[PDB]
Amino acid sequence: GSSGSSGPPAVSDIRVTRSSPSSLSLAWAVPRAPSGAVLDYEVKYHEKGAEGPSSVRFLKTSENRAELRGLKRGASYLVQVRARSEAGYGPFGQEHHSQTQLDSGPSSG
16 A cells, blocks of 8 residues: 555546537546545546647536536547545546447447
8 A cells, every 4th residue: 555645536436427519527426535525626638639738628626526518529538537635636536438429329129
């Protein structure tokens, strides 16, 4: 184990509901912090083929859910949700990939 943690545990079980072509709502499961409790969260989403600090966007939310807007439907997007605690900014949870599918009537079988 690492002596002296920086923040909360890397957000996990990140489910995405209410999908959309020009928007993507994200929601994680209130993770257990090694101290006190979580405060806010950050969502970093940047196309899967760009460079530069500006290219990537940032979203500050005080909840465990966010609603992204204006996005390139279909184009893969690497989103990362991190939690912030009294200690400090925690490590970005395990990479998260959306579906942003384009189908209408999916066959289950």
